[PDB]
Design a protein around this ligand. Structure first.
Ligand SMILES: [Cu+2]
Ligand SMILES: [Cu+2]
Ligand SMILES: [Cu+2]
Ligand SMILES: [Cu+2]
Ligand SMILES: [Cu+2]
Ligand SMILES: [Cu+2]
Ligand SMILES: [Zn+2]
Ligand SMILES: [Zn+2]
Ligand SMILES: [Zn+2]
Lengths: 333, 333, 333
C-alpha cells in the first residue's frame, strides 16, 4: 500500500455521487477522502418539527465514497471545536478494530486519518459508533455509504456486463422525536438536552418520522431525482439502523443486490426488495416510460404517513405497447 | 398487441385461483379481466370486531389474476355508485403511470379499462392507490396478486421443470382497528367516519389484528385448505403493506421464490421464508404425510394472538420412515 | 431405519456445540438424544429483572443437536414432575405431525421418544408448541437449533469445500416482561401468574428486552466467544419468534446461509444478514485481525438498549495491510 499511487477525491452531497469509473484499467490506489462532522438542529417535516442532528459533512446521509476492489480508503475525519460530542467512524467495508471506530475517536478540536483495504466489493454502510452512545449517533444522522466497485464493473448472474448511466444515493433515517405532555414534538436548545427523552422514544422501537435524506419530501419538487427513458439508474439505499423495503412505483428493480454485495449474483424483476437495518443495497433500473415515479419504502404507512418516499421525474416518449389506457374513466354503461 | 387474439377470464374467489395452464404452447394473448370494487363493513374476528373494509370483487384479498409472460393484461375496473370513495389500481407487474393508477381513477358510478404488457414473470401485488389516501385503501383490504407464469412453466435452479397440482392464494392483512376510551374496538356507521381514528392507529405501526383472507380463522374448519399426500401445492402469499414470514408447520418450502419473481432460481428446503411488505411470494410443497398442517406467519404472536394462521387438511397414508412415535407419552421410568 | 446402527450423543450447553464431524465417511445412523425441560425464574438483565422462563435442558437457547443428512434423529423428551406445564417439541427439520409436537405431548411426570428422518440439510429451529399456548412457551425460552450437515460437508456456490474450525450457537430471545403502575418490571411468584400480563405485552409486539442466550451481556466478559486469526468460526443464529439482522463489527459474513439451508448457495461478503422469525441461519467467518469484535443485531437500539449483542475476543497478530491508523487523533492543524 506504501508502494501505490495516491488519488484525492472531492465528495459531493447526496443524492448525487462523486464522479467515478465503473470498469477501470487502473491498478489499485490509495484513495484519499476527508469528511468534517457537523452537529446541527435540522427541520425535518412540513410542520416545523426539529431534530437535534449529527452529520458527516453536513448532510443526512453523509456523502457516498466510491472506490474499486483492491483500493485502499484513506479517510481524514475532522471533528471541529464547534461540536459538543466525540465521534468516530465504523466502515462495514473494512476489516478490524470495530470497522475503524477504535482508531478514529475524535474529540471536538481533533482529527484522525484511517487507512483500510477495500478488499470486498459492494455497497457498505459507514456510521459513527462512540462507545456508550452508538444508537443515538446513528439515528441522529451519522451514516452513509462506501461503494466498492469490482475492478471490471458490475456483472449479471451469467457474468455478463452491467452498468448504470447515473447513480443516486438515498439514506433512509428512522427518527425518534419526543413529545411533551401537550402532544407536540419537543424542541431542544442543545444536542445534549435531547438525549434522555430521545433514548426513551428509541426504546419504544416506533419512529416518529422515517425520512429519505434528512426530511419529509427531501427528494420531491425541485429536488426530485431525474432521468430519461433509456437511461439506467443505480439506486443506492442505506439504512444503518432499521429494515426498509424499497419499491419504484411504475417500475422494477431490473437487477438488485438487496444485501448489497456485488460478488453475489443479483436478482431480477423485483417489485420490492429488502434492505436489512445496518446495510446498504443497490438496484439497477432502465427507464422505459416517461413520467413521475415514486421511490418509497413499501410499508405504505412508513412511506406516506411517516415520510419514507421520494420522486423521480423521467423525460421521454410514452410507450403504448407497455401500457395503454383503453377506456378513460367514464360512467358505467 | 392490436394484432393478438383476446381471451376472457372468469375470476374465482380466494383461496382458489382461476383455471389456467402452466407451460403452454399458446402464443401471447390479450387477456381480459373485470373487477368490481365493493366497500363494506366486515366482521374480522371471533368477538364481533368490525372493519370498515374496501375490496376488489368483494373479497380480501382481491382475486388472483393469472397470465403468461408476454401476454397483455386488460382489466376493466368498475366503481359502482353504491360506493362512497374514488379508487384506482396499481399493478406492480406493470410498467408506467404509477402501475396504472394514474390511468384508472374511478369515481363512484365510473369504470375504466387499462391494458399493460405482462413482460416479467412472477407473483406481483396489485393494489388501490388513490392520491392522498394510499395506505388507508391498502390496509382496509384493496390488494391481490397478479401471477405471470413463464411461457414454459416454472424451473428449478438447474433449469429443470417444476409444477404444482393445485394453487392457493393467501392475502395477509395487517389491520388497524381503533379503540374507544372503554378499551373496546370502535364500530363505525360509515367508511368515512373510520378514517381519522384509523390513521392514528396506523401511525403507531402496531396492527390490532393480522389476518389471512379477511378474518381470524378464515382458512380453518370447513374453510381449511386441502391436499393429499403426493400432491404439489403452490402457496401464493401477498402482503401489500407489511413484512411477513410464512411457515408450514410439519412441512417445508420445497422450492420458494420469496421475492416472487420466477426468472430467479428458487431456494430449497426452507423452514420459514420472507415476504417483503409490498410484494407477493410463491412456495411449492409436495405433501409426504397426511394430517392437519398449520400455515402461518412465524412471528407466533402475530399468528396465534393476532390471527395470521390457517390450516391445511391433508389426506393419505402415514409414513413411519419420515416420522415415528417410538414411545408414546408415559410416566418417567 | 430399523436396520441402522445407533449412536448416542451427549449434548453441551450453548454457546458451544457438541463434538461432530463435518464431511463424514459414515453411513446413516439413528442418532439418539435426550433433553429435560426445566421451568425456572431467571435474572435477565443488570438491574435484577426476572423472567418466568421455560427451557430445554436448563438453557436459553436449548442445546444445538447436530446430525448428518439421511440420519434419523431420535429424541427422548422428559418433562419432570417438578414442572407446572405440559410441553412438547416441534422440529422444523422434521416432516409430519406438526414437526413432532402432536407425538410428544408430555405432562409433568411424563416423557416421550420421537424419531424423524433428517432428510434436509441446514440449521433448523426446534421449539415447544403446546396447543393454545404456543407463543408463550416460545418467547419464555423454549427453542434451539437442529443442524443437519450435508454428508460431504459444506459447499460454496461453485461446489468447492467449505469448513469451520469452531462452531458457536446463539439463540436470540425477544422478551415481553410486564411493568406495574410504578413503571418497574413485575416479579412473579409462579410461572402461571406471569401468563395474563405477559400476553398483554406480547400483543404490543414490542419486546422489553432482546437477549442472546438468556441475558443481557450473556456473551461478554469471561463469557465472550473466542477465536484466533486464521481460524474459521461458524456462527449459528436462531430466532424462533422475531426477525433479527446479525452483524460482526469489524468483520463480515464470508459465507452466509441467511435462510439456513445448506443445499442453497451461500452469499459472500455480507455486512449484515437477516434471520427470519421462526428460523436459524448460519455464517462462516475467517478472522484476519486480532481484537475484541461485537456480534450483534444491527437494529442498534435492539442491540445496545435492549440487549442483543455479544463479544468475540480474538488472539493473533495485527495486519497493517488490512487496516492502519495513519494519524492518531490529534488537534486539528
Ligand atoms: Cu458521532
Ligand atoms: Cu455498524
Ligand atoms: Cu381504493
Ligand atoms: Cu405498491
Ligand atoms: Cu413448553
Ligand atoms: Cu415453528
Ligand atoms: Zn437548557
Ligand atoms: Zn355518523
Ligand atoms: Zn400468587
Amino acid at each position: 500500500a506504501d508502494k501505490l499511487p495516491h488519488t484525492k477525491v472531492t465528495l459531493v452531497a447526496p443524492p448525487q455521487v462523486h464522479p467515478h469509473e465503473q470498469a477501470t484499467k487502473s491498478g489499485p490506489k490509495v484513495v484519499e477522502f476527508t469528511m468534517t462532522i457537523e452537529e446541527k438542529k435540522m427541520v425535518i417535516d412540513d410542520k416545523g418539527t426539529t431534530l437535534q442532528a449529527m452529520t458527516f459533512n453536513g448532510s443526512m446521509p453523509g456523502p457516498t465514497l466510491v472506490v474499486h476492489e483492491g483500493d485502499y480508503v484513506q479517510l481524514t475525519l475532522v471533528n471541529p471545536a464547534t461540536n459538543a460530542m466525540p465521534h468516530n467512524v465504523d466502515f462495514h467495508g473494512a476489516t478490524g478494530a470495530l470497522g475503524g471506530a477504535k482508531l478514529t475517536n475524535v474529540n471536538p478540536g481533533e482529527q484522525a486519518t484511517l487507512r483500510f483495504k477495500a478488499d470486498r466489493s459492494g455497497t457498505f454502510v459507514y456510521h459513527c459508533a462512540p462507545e456508550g452512545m452508538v444508537p443515538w449517533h446513528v439515528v441522529s444522522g451519522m451514516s452513509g455509504t462506501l461503494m466498492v466497485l469490482p475492478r471490471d464493473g458490475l456483472k449479471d448472474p451469467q457474468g455478463k456486463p452491467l452498468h448504470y448511466d447515473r447513480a443516486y444515493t438515498i439514506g433512509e433515517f428512522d427518527l425518534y422525536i419526543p413529545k411533551g405532555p401537550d402532544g407536540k414534538y419537543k424542541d431542544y436548545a442543545t444536542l445534549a438536552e435531547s438525549y434522555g427523552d430521545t433514548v426513551q422514544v428509541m426504546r419504544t422501537l416506533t419512529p416518529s418520522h422515517i425520512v429519505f435524506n434528512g426530511k419529509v419530501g427531501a427528494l420531491t419538487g425541485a429536488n426530485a431525482l431525474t432521468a430519461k427513458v433509456g437511461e439506467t439508474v443505480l439506486l443506492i439505499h442505506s439504512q444503518a439502523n432499521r429494515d426498509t423495503r424499497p419499491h419504484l412505483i411504475g417500475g422494477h428493480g431490473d437487477w438488485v443486490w438487496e444485501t448489497g454485495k456485488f460478488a453475489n449474483p443479483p436478482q431480477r424483476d423485483l417489485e420490492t426488495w429488502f434492505i436489512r437495518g445496518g446495510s446498504a443495497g443497490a438496484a439497477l433500473y432502465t427507464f422505459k416510460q416517461p413520467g413521475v415515479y415514486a421511490y418509497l419504502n413499501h410499508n405504505l404507512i412508513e412511506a406516506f404517513e411517516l415520510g419514507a418516499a421520494g420522486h423521480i421525474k423521467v423525460e421521454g416518449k410514452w410507450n403504448d405497447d407497455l401500457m395503454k389506457q383503453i377506456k378513460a374513466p367514464a360512467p358505467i354503461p
